Amino acid sequence: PINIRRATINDIICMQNANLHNLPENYMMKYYMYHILSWPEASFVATTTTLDGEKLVGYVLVKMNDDPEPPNGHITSLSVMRTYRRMGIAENLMRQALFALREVHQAEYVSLHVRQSNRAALHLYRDTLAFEVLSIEKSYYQDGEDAYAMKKVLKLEELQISNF
């Protein structure tokens, strides 16, 4: 039973261990100690909930306009342990990640790079969430693949953490 936490820095070793087991994105341990030590509030992680530690099961890292211009939000990488998916998990760990990405820092437009080649992502990621497209960047991925951009406007009241 996945619990949806607020992501701590303790969970960088166990976070990045998942976006690597389950993803073709090799990332360093700096580029986690600055997502979660610049804008640590709006990047969420969620996995295992046992009482009477925890196991990583799925996470969500979300940086802002790192590079230089009206307060733009981004989302770096997202994944989940297979034997856990299709049970929300992914599908409502982001309705909070946006629902803080315009509450704390207050940024008006999300953004990202989803491959596809891809069902899971380029579906409840433009039909559930609604997130147009913008530039379809070709070979912008490290496999000769071409991957959708995805913009996603966010105006507070029209995306709260309890519409379900």
Binding site: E25, H113, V114
Partner: peptide
């Protein structure tokens, strides 16, 4: 899945 190579 932001690409730090490219």
């Amino acid at each position: 899945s932001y690409s730090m190579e490219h």
